Amino acid sequence: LKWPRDLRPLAHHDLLYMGQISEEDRGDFNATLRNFLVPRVVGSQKHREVREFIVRSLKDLDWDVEEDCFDGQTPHGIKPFCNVIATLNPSACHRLVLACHYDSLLHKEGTFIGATDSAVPCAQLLYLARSLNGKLQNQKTRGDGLTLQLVFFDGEEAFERWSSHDSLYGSRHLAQKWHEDRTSAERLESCLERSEIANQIDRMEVMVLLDLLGAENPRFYSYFGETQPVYRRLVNIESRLNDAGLMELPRRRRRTNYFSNSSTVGFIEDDHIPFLKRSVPIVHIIPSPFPDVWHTLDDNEQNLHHPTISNLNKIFKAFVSEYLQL
């Protein structure tokens, strides 16, 4: 079976313009990121402040923003959680869904910033929205049944020992709410004709999950067959960007090669898992191997590699522009 949306390739000139990262872009992304570079412990004050910042930032760009709050029991007792869900055009039938988590790991030995995990991926999502905003507001006007949706999960990390009950507090909750919330094509703007929509979860066209990003030389693989047609667009985009000479490398005539055009499995359990059990196609942008710093106290700003971040932003901007045909 083919992908349900025709896969039409980014115009060369957009490819170039997405491949730019000016001084202002660097400044903007870094100023976005600085707000995240604090420990974001579930239930904490800084955690709350981080959430408020995400919300203000998306509402300031006329997205619909939802704060999805609930309490859950954990090995460390009861905790409040708030997922943040931002949707450009609510009434659009289908969503390209980009996601990360904004909670940080409770480390035993001290303050854990969680720069790759997932401060940077949270910055990346907001940066995309801010930099592509004019185009996103133009795309919305089409009313052609597709929009962009960002989710910033809460409580992804295990408090004690990773298990089915201790991890993914936010995803498990939202996946479930949305599965149970019934709808149909006739209640929604411009569904594709083949569509069989019985609930909100059916409206997630593909879920692209970002985690552990910001270190040198990531290596990604396609972790899901269902989503290989989409994963391929990442490989192709990285390649066009290198051809165009728009990747940042240490010497001239080098090429990045982050997205390996091959696959493996892992099943690195994550925020995708509860959506996957209800048939939501998934692309997990997570590296194999995990970085140096994973879950150490040195997952901090000093260990972030700004040339890699820039390159990835290029790929993500272009990727979103191609999927949504901006």
Swiss-Prot record:
GO biological process: peptidyl-pyroglutamic acid biosynthetic process, using glutaminyl-peptide cyclotransferase
Enzyme Commission numbers on file: 2.3.2.5
Binding-site residues for Zn(2+), renumbered to this chain: D117, E157, H295
Outcome of gene disruption: RNAi-mediated knockdown results in reduced enzymatic activity in midgut and salivary gland tissue extracts. Weight gain after feeding is reduced. Females lay very small eggs which fail to hatch into larvae.
Active site as annotated: E156 (proton acceptor), D211 (proton acceptor)
Enzyme class: transferase
InterPro entries, per database record: M28_QC, Peptidase_M28, QC/QCL
Subcellular location: Secreted
CDD domains (UniProt xref): M28_QC_like
Protein name per its UniProtKB record: Glutaminyl-peptide cyclotransferase
Species, as recorded: Ixodes scapularis
Gene this chain is encoded by: Qptc
